[model samples]
Target: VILTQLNEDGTTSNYFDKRKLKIAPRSTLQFKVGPPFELVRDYCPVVESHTGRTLDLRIIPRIDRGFDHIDEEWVGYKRNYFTLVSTFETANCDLDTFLKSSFDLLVGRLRVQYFAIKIKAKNDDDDTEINLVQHTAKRDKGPQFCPSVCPLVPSPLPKHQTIREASNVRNITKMKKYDSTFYLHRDHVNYEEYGVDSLLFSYPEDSIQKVARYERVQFASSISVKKPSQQNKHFSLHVILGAVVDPDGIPYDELALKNGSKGMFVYLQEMKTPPLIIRGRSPSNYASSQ
Candidate 1:
């Protein structure tokens, strides 16, 4: 697969290699800066054959102070945590058409909420995470590893990351069913949603190939380092589709998630991009740097 890096001069660079990006001292991840992203990829998304429902996506990003000493990417105070907000638009049909087909949903309508991406590894179920700090409160760790989030969860952020291969003990309380990698971006301030006119989406109408697309929106996500962030890691960002009773609790275990899957909870066809690389770079935000 090919990758493109949006450079500062407003021109773009193409590559046959996987994508890599910088982890500056402080960044909101603006486009003109280092990290590059896009909704437009190598091929047009093949419209779904059946009339079930689906969405085309453009994932925005979020960043704050997140880190641990174990990882090599460390340069300063804030580089370990990785957060993304997926702004997506529907395809083949509108939201109303979707609700019409997916009658099992609630009134006013249902929208894709949680997003999941898994790390690719050869053997054994490795770990990748979101809302990690929510669980780390159970054990005592350092400040960089865990910022104080709330009254008792024992951390400052809503996300965390840790692998179980070196499993020792489960000291946490009230373990909710959400997988470590499955993310629900709980921060209202960091979240964005709503539709805008974008040429980014194209579909058919009555045999006419070109039609306007609307309802491009984003859902937020936060995946962070647990006690100590480890070495260079990579996760293939894939959208996880599911239906919920209300906006609470994990979906049914029948959601059938392990590494990845299809049918029922189908993993949307993902664009091939290099892994999100995190490495040390000095501040270069003349655009937003105050």
Candidate 2:
């Protein structure tokens, strides 16, 4: 399981082994993403490394070098979830139905920022180099609106312009390293470069047998991992630290679900594996967040 510490200003800690991680006694967002392809294959299993740690039902768990003054509020909390889209369709006909359901689910959920999806691909054992996949919020089409369908419209409080401009950015935002806040998309370069250690999920997109290593190897076998040019794709952990309102944060004003539809099962599917939150290092870490 690839667990991440979701930070306040949007920068995450290195992917370190749990015992080495040093945060607790405070509130934080912890996202535990299970082994990508393995979890989906029949016989559901828990992330073993996590399981053995004497877990948290969820050790629940960054750094935005913060700013001064005082200004932050929450006119939105509904945006507590994320839906990692599956481009597994790889341009298939069935993709449209899935895409719509994903969008409706997203807006219905609310303000999961477009950039929130940017994640780091780092080796669990080392931090020599960390690659990033960036993304943005954009309409299904290029840089235009679905007028009749999806468009970031202004909320009744039209306290907009920043909102209007923000809408424009989501659609125009693009990149290759992957997503930027690219809260939505499919892996373009290497679809299966997701595993941290042990039998790193290799892809048949090419063939080169190499033993991938990292800090731990609890999941590996004597045999080298192999692939036979498969189908479908990968996963990403989407985390949202619901609204707390120390300063009453307002919705992006441009992030309303104008589509009017529902079905967030995709968001929930990943949740079934749930989080292994164990921040009890501090007594209040339970109901805690300041």
Candidate 3:
């Protein structure tokens, strides 16, 4: 009985002091978000099925449809890092309803544009349905943003006038989808869809090489900076990419960075109403001239 080793009275290896694990007081960060309205856009695709060999019809990898060209300069990128943003009005609203509505809107537009699947049959049959699959395009759950202290300015019209006006401006700029070229990156490929039979080429290698499957998942982000100057002294713009998490270490989706969720975050930068460009031309002048 006297041969047992003795331990210190306060030495208990099973537990650690809570204070030691707490976040250092000086290391914490605090910030504020002010907004008249903010739009957050997220572009990422989730894999639906992994175990099966067949391409999950629901999983449509945002294929790089290429970029747009305007005369000499490139306008924008297409499907590779496809741009998916919620309409201005839908931003900062109820999560479930907003996604469902947005999904419906996308589906509606896609359907209107003659959305169909081109299936290849193994038997070389002429009747192989090229456009069969419909309504199989499903989406996974994503984050939704609801500003804690932000003000809501609902539009008077049922349709989002901001987007419509923006589209009008884009039209003026001659931004055509066909004029653009989209490039595929290694991160954007969905490998599960490609079994041993698929031939795919990726970046870093100029030549087209055969691959077992091209599977990589990535999220696309686009940021713009507007600097403040002497003429614009009252306004300041800062863009930040931050992380959100729960107490138990579960990460919260920032919605903007999450896949499929798209919206923008904006602030009231200009208090004075800027003068509109009162150009001496009709709205259709830009198109007619082209």
Using TM-score as the measure, the top candidate is 1
Judged by whole-model lDDT over C-alpha atoms, candidate 3 comes out at 0.19
RMSD of each: 17.3, 23.1, 27.4
Give the TM-score of each candidate.
Answer: 0.28, 0.19, 0.14
Q: In angstroms, how far off is 216's CA in candidate 1?
A: 22
lDDT of 2 at 126: 27
| Cα lDDT tens digits for candidate 3, 131-235 | 111111121243322112111111111112221222223353444431111122323446555443222221122221111111111112221111144221111
Off by over 4 Å in 1: 1-83, 99-238, 245-273, 279-290
Model 3 spans with C-alpha error above 4 angstroms? 1-188, 193-233, 243-290
Q: What is the C-alpha lDDT of each candidate?
A: 0.25, 0.20, 0.19
TM-score of 1: 0.28
Error of 1 at 58 (Å): 9.9
| Candidate 2 structure quality by residue, lDDT tens digits, 1-290 | 22454433344422323333333412222222222221212111112132222101110111111110111210100111111211111122232222222111122133111111111222222222222222234322334211111111011111112111222233433332212222222333343433322111211112211110011111111211121453211112222211110111222212222133331111211111121111113323222332
Model 1 over residues 1-290: C-alpha lDDT tens digits? 42455543444333321113333433323111112233323112212224433344332321212211122221211122333222233434454333223222222343322222221111112434322221232223622232110101001122212111112234453123322222222232121331222111111111110111111111112332122565534422222222212222212223332333421222322332223332232254122323
Give model 3's clash tally.
20
Better of 1 and 2 by lDDT: 1
